Design a protein around this ligand. Structure first.
Ligand SMILES: Nc1ncnc2c1ncn2[C@@H]1O[C@H](COP(=O)(O)OP(=O)(O)OC[C@H]2O[C@@H](O)[C@H](O)[C@@H]2O)[C@@H](O)[C@H]1O
Ligand SMILES: Nc1ncnc2c1ncn2[C@@H]1O[C@H](COP(=O)(O)OP(=O)(O)OC[C@H]2O[C@@H](O)[C@H](O)[C@@H]2O)[C@@H](O)[C@H]1O
Ligand SMILES: [Zn+2]
Ligand SMILES: [Zn+2]
Ligand SMILES: [Zn+2]
Ligand SMILES: [Zn+2]
Lengths: 150, 150
């Protein structure tokens, strides 16, 4: 386990033959209101475009997933709500340890990055038409909706 | 766009203030048979455990997504089938450009990593119980099933 780089949000290490990127864990929030899902878009230099995502971010020191979810929702959309933990996933276990904890937000209230309210059916349609790209969080939100929120 | 490391499956670069990991694109295959989804597990040093995933891998030079999907399915499970492109997603656009193309496989045939046939409902239950972890591909497969394959 030798380190080649220690950065701000990631470290690059070598474990034998494997190249490993250590990354802080993240959270993502699925929120539905009047049939529209709360998506967000922002310039992502890593990909050179703005994919359709849902409110998400890195867990700060001292924070547990639930608290980070509350914070990211408020900072990105100015909203607050009743949060329920759904599930988690490793974004790409073949090279990084980034783990994402997904929550559902209900009873949204305005308490205070482009906010994109859109019907999940439309988001999926646009993507199929090649008009927009998805981040893992955006796709998970869309599929979760079709599976359990209709 | 300065490079700090050029590796086998990834390059570490710096674009101004952003740390960027360039990664080859990938494919993932969702396959259902008799109510069971085709999951796979393998030791993943990046996370120190074996999460529940679906057949997936990197696209090789000269390959398009469909061909890579065919290959990964055959090499990991010894199966072949009729493949249909579903959608794609960026695993974590905040730092890497890894993009995953997801396909559906039908009419599986044996033509020739642990193969784990499991009902998606059971996979979800086990995860909720904290008995197993999910990779993004595994979760996407589970949600896709609940949304469109029941
Ligand atoms: N994180 C990783 N870093 C470097 N090589 C890897 C990684 N994960 C898999 N591989 C290599 O790619 C091949 C997978 O096919 C394997 O032979 C393995 O050596
Ligand atoms: N890929 C990245 N590399 C480094 N810093 C990043 C990246 N993505 C976001 N950030 C930093 O983290 C903060 C996000 O909150 C921002 O202020 C930004 O500077
Ligand atoms: Zn943040
Ligand atoms: Zn921070
Ligand atoms: Zn491979
Ligand atoms: Zn290869």
């Amino acid at each position: 386990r030798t380190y080649l780089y220690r950065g701000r949000i990631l470290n690059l290490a070598l474990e034998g033959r494997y190249e490993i990127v250590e990354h802080k864990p993240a959270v993502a929030v699925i929120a539905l209101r009047e049939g529209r899902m709360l998506f967000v878009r922002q310039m992502r230099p890593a990909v050179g475009l703005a994919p359709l995502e849902i409110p998400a971010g890195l867990i700060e020191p001292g924070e547990d997933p639930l608290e980070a979810a509350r914070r990211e929702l408020a900072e990105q959309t100015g909203l607050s709500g009743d949060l329920t933990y759904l599930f988690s996933y490793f974004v790409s276990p073949g090279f990084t340890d980034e783990k994402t904890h997904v929550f559902l937000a209900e009873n949204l209230k305005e308490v205070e990055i482009e906010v994109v309210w859109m019907r999940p059916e439309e988001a999926l349609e646009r993507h199929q038409r090649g008009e927009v790209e998805f981040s893992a969080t955006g796709l998970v939100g869309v599929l979760y909706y079709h599976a359990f929120l209709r």
